Amino acid sequence: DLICAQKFNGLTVLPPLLTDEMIAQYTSALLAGTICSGWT
Amino acid sequence: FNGLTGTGVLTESNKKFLPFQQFGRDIADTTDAVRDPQTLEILDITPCS
Numbered sequence: 001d002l003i004c005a006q007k008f009n010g011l012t013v014l015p016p017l018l019t020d021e022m023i024a025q026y027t028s029a030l031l032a033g034t035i036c037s038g039w040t
Numbered sequence: 041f042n043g044l045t046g047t048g049v050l051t052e053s054n055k056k057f058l059p060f061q062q063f064g065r066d067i068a069d070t071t072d073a074v075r076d077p078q079t080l081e082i083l084d085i086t087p088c089s
């Protein structure tokens with residue numbers, strides 16, 4: 001359906017390769033590694 | 041439409057044109073809506089995907 005005026009003049013927006021639900025999983029993995037191991 | 045040429049999908053609008061207004065424009069000066077010269081209904085123009 002209708003989106004915007006920028007989208008209709010050749011100006012498109014590409015989605016990021018990493019979604020937020022996986023950036024958050026990377027962050028959670030970093031936090032868990034810090035808690036369980038430390039700097040090791 | 042009345043000499044105004046273009047390409048797109050003519051849906052039906054909820055726009056309320058005043059009697060002296062025939063076509064409408066957006067910030068890019070592209071006609072976003074036109075008034076049918078005969079049935080006098082407001083059609084929403086959106087270029088094809």
Ligand SMILES: *[C@@H]1O[C@H](CO)[C@@H](O)[C@H](O)[C@H]1NC(C)=O
Nearest residue numbers: 075076077078079080081082
């Ligand atoms: C011309 O006549 C009527 C009244 O103006 C209009 O609504 C109708 O669409 C027109 N007829 C056509 C284009 O056949």
